[PDB]
Amino acid sequence: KETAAAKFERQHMDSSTSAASSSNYCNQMMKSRNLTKDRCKPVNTFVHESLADVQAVCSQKNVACKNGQTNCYQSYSTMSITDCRETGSSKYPNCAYKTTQANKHIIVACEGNPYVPVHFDASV
């Protein structure tokens, strides 16, 4: 088992780099983090901020989640993220991704005790 919170850090945290390093980035990371094991995860965002910073978002701006639930929060500041988007030539198990760096507000769903991020909802 892996807790919800550990899963979030696995799928979305990458504080070692401040930006989307290369055009290779998503191809390497999606595989490293086991995001291309059962299929190619269509889209995935990595956050290049400190873990304390991303956790703090749970006390920031409360907004509606895409799914209609209300445990979503938006960062007051923009954060450095990298979006990974599956390409056309991407054919499981040979998943292919486009790497895109950006600075945006992230929206995460939080839960538990302590209240931590468990899902990445959107970036804006």
Side-chain angles (χ1 to χ4, degrees), residues 2-124:
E2 177 179 43
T3 62
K7 181 182 212 159
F8 177 94
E9 308 180 27
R10 174 169 60 76
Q11 304 188 108
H12 308 291
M13 296 301 300
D14 179 26
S15 318
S16 318
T17 66
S18 53
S21 44
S22 63
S23 45
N24 284 331
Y25 186 82
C26 285
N27 288 328
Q28 309 165 320
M29 291 294 302
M30 292 300 286
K31 193 178 166 196
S32 289
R33 300 298 183 80
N34 276 283
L35 300 172
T36 64
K37 192 196 179 174
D38 292 350
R39 50 195 291 273
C40 311
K41 188 177 187 191
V43 74
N44 194 65
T45 306
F46 285 97
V47 178
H48 311 289
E49 293 301 337
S50 63
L51 180 53
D53 282 354
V54 174
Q55 284 167 161
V57 174
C58 294
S59 67
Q60 301 184 13
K61 188 205 199 165
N62 184 223
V63 295
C65 303
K66 285 179 165 162
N67 77 346
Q69 280 192 258
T70 54
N71 59 319
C72 280
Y73 301 82
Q74 186 174 311
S75 65
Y76 288 125
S77 306
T78 52
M79 294 187 171
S80 185
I81 60 164
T82 296
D83 277 315
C84 299
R85 209 90 95 208
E86 194 185 19
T87 68
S89 73
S90 187
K91 267 312 142 183
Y92 181 87
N94 301 115
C95 309
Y97 295 92
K98 173 172 48 72
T99 297
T100 309
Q101 167 61 211
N103 264 276
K104 299 171 70 187
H105 300 276
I106 65 172
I107 295 169
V108 294
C110 300
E111 58 189 34
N113 179 34
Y115 205 51
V116 295
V118 299
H119 151 84
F120 194 94
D121 207 52
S123 65
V124 300

